[PDB]
């Protein structure tokens, strides 16, 4: 219910997220400054890095050595940011002076180092941003010593920046072995370089790298490289895309392990190969035995777009596929397997060109098997299909992220239009369709979701961030449901009918919603309420009722009977009813002066436990004075009699004139 915490940006728009996951502070890379806000987006520190002097054709950058082309004020967007939680510091990689990287101190921002003047200090000049991903991997803890594995893009220019490496840590920022690889000879280094070969048969070529991920003993990317097939020689712009898995080991110091399967989807005979996000989540005991996975397996949500045409545009139509981590170390450990038996290739035309042949060797592969110097790099043959959950044909999805709720597994999508649908997934809905859209909150309208999309530590709010804002989004939204008829109804996984306190909320929310009927698990629980009489006429007063009540806890507290906001009959409790007094004909009289034939009143069941009205049913007060004809009276759906020598219409029946004036049935009416 109430408005979402808010953090808007000065002239300067953002680009990635992350949360720090003990203090719950949180970290926003950003065109030229990178921003620390707090819990509740309040800014903290605010660290300035730009724009520079600099042009993109400088290399190395003017504060080295001098450059030619001539300089420029350009803006410094953040490429990538990542947290050393060992070294309580933080790496934010600018798009400057070919793409240094700061090393901000986490808890005043303090600039530790920007180590610049090595070839290896320079990881990209691209300027694109969420284009780069990669992952933190500190070694033993009294070493200090890190590894960092890093995918950019490199714009062709594949002399000077690998498209993918493996760099070390140094714990003293200022050092000049900070960036460089943590294997390096004559032969092979912790290293991949794009051959100068591939580019100049296809002019612009390169691989963008959207999601990344440490998993095991591995890390994951998923990236989206031009397709050398679909394409011809000709750089017209009809270049096709295709969405590739990628799998290293941490603890492969050559590169041998690499391996790269396409990935994808389809849902109704629709294409979606080119991925937009991804998310690594442990699915939750209810997803789990619906897939067979062990507790300890985990899943990756991914969002493709429709098609493999256009990378810097893909079209609205989107899909949010999954793919199980088991299945990917299967099609792994079965395409290299494959190798070792001599059938077949390794298969990656843009890094090895000339079709060697897969080689024969007596090694049984295990599922942590990495590589050696034969049989590598492995390619991709069969594209892994994934299992669709979701699709758009209106509004394209952007970002992706998931958690688990009591069981209940829960997927933030987001939106161009800003949006962030709360999606469910099971099998078991009866309907044949996986997952559910249960909510569509709005974080900030006409601005597209940026990918990075997490979780405060406590699982209470997503930070969802747009180019303009940040907006700390309730995950938890029970309280937005009135009635136990719609909040049960709502299918929301978190939010059940705390019953005696009238509100929708969680099942730890609800004061002692662990004893029986305190709680509303299933809809075809809610509190249900039935009055004998439900009718009386203005011509009664406290005329005794008698109320039975469902679904209702130990009501032994004190209840009383409210109708609507007149009378308030204390109760009395007997068996498994409740018995309570109609108001008295001076009370009704203002209820029903004016409304006429009949007025229906919510007689409602207050808690003397709580004191908030929990359960309704519908009361009725009925006047037959008001009835002009004969046919009035007693067609009426009470019991009224007409006098048809008086020419009225009454309850009470001595009102009339004489007896034969009485007139119960309608064919005794005259005319
Ligand atoms: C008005 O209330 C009366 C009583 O609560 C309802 O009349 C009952 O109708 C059933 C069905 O024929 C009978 O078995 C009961 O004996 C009736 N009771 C009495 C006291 O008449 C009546 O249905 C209600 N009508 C409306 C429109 O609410
Ligand atoms: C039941 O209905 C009757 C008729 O509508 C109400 O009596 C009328 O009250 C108005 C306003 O005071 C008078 O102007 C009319 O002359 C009255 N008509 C009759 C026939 O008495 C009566 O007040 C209603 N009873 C309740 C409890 O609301
Ligand atoms: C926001 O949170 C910070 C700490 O996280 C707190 O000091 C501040 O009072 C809060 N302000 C608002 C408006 O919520
Ligand atoms: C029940 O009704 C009586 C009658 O006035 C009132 O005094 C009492 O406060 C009511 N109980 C609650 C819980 O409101």
């Given at each position: 219910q109430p408005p979402f915490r808010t953090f808007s940006a000065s002239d300067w728009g953002l680009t990635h997220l992350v949360v720090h996951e003990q203090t719950g502070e949180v970290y926003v890379g950003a065109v030229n400054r990178i921003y620390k806000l707090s819990g509740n987006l309040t800014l903290l520190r605010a660290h300035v890095t730009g724009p520079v002097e600099d042009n993109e054709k400088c290399y190395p950058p003017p504060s080295v050595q001098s450059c030619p082309h001539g300089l420029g004020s350009t803006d410094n967007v953040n490429k990538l940011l990542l947290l050393d939680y060992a070294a309580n510091r933080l790496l934010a990689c600018g798009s400057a002076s070919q793409g240094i990287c700061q090393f901000l101190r986490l808890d005043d921002l303090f600039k530790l180092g920007e180590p610049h003047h090595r070839k290896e200090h320079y990881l990209s000049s691209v300027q694109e941003a969420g284009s780069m991903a990669g992952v933190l991997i500190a070694g033993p803890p009294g070493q200090g010593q890190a590894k960092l594995f890093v995918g950019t893009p490199i714009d062709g220019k594949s002399e000077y920046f690998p498209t993918l490496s493996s760099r070390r840590l140094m714990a003293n920022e200022e050092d000049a072995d900070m960036f460089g690889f943590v294997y390096q000879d004559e032969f092979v280094s912790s290293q991949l370089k794009i051959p100068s070969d591939?580019?100049?048969?296809?002019?612009?070529?390169?691989?963008?790298?959207?999601?990344?991920?440490?998993?095991?003993?591995?890390?994951?990317?998923?990236?989206?490289?031009?397709?050398?097939?679909?394409?011809?020689?000709?750089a017209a712009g009809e270049h096709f895309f295709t969405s590739k898995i990628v799998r290293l080991c941490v603890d492969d110091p050559k590169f041998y392990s690499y391996v790269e399967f396409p990935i994808g989807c389809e849902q109704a005979g629709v294409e979606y190969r080119l991925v937009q996000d991804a998310y690594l989540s442990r699915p939750g005991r209810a997803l789990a035995h619906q897939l067979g996975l062990a507790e300890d397996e985990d899943v990756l949500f991914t969002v493709f777009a429709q098609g493999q045409k256009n990378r810097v545009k893909p079209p609205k139509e989107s899909a949010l596929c999954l793919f199980t981590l088991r299945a990917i170390k299967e099609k792994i450990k079965e395409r290299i397997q494959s190798c070792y038996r001599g059938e077949g290739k390794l298969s990656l035309p843009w890094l090895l060109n000339k079709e060697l042949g897969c080689i024969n060797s007596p090694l049984q592969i295990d599922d942590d098997f990495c590589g050696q110097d034969f049989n590598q790099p492995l390619g991709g043959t069969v594209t892994i299909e994934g299992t669709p959950l979701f699709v758009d044909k209106d509004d394209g999805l952007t970002a992706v992220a998931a958690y688990d709720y009591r069981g209940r597994t829960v997927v933030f999508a987001g939106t161009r239009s800003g949006r962030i649908?709360?999606?469910?997934?099971?099998?078991?809905?009866?309907?044949?369709?996986?997952?559910?859209?249960?909510?569509?909150?709005?974080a900030q309208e006409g601005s597209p979701i940026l990918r990075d999309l997490v979780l405060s530590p406590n699982h209470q709010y997503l930070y969802a961030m747009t180019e303009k804002q940040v907006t700390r989004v309730p995950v938890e939204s029970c309280v937005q449901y009135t009635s136990c008829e719609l909040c049960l109804g709502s299918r929301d996984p978190h939010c059940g009918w705390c019953v005696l306190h009238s509100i929708c909320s969680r099942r730890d929310a609800?004061?002692?919603?662990?004893?029986?009927?305190?709680?509303?698990?299933?809809?075809?629980?809610?509190?249900?309420?039935?009055?004998?009489?439900?009718?009386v006429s203005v011509t009664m007063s406290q005329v005794p009722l008698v109320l039975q009540a469902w679904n209702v806890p130990d009501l032994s507290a004190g209840v009383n009977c409210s109708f609507e906001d007149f009378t308030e009959s204390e109760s009395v409790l007997e068996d498994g009813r409740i018995h309570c007094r109609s108001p008295s004909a001076?009370?009704?009289a203002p209820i029903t002066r004016g409304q006429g034939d009949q007025r229906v009143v919510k007689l409602y069941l207050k808690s003397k436990e709580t004191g908030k009205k929990f359960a309704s049913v519908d009361f009725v007060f009925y006047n037959c004075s008001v009835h002009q004809s004969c046919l009035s009276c007693v067609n009426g759906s009470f019991p009224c009699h007409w006098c048809k020598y008086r020419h009225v219409c009454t309850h009470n029946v001595a009102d009339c004139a004489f007896l034969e004036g009485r007139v119960n049935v309608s064919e005794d009416c005259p005319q």
């Open positions: 591939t580019l100049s048969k296809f002019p612009a070529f390169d691989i963008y790298y959207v999601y990344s991920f440490r998993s095991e003993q591995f890390v994951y990317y998923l990236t989206l490289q031009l397709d050398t097939q679909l394409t011809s020689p000709d649908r709360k999606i469910l997934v099971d099998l078991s809905n009866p309907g044949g369709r996986p997952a559910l859209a249960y909510e569509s909150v709005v609800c004061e002692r919603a662990d004893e029986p009927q305190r709680f509303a698990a299933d809809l075809l629980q809610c509190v249900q309420l039935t009055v004998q009489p439900r009718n001076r009370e009704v």
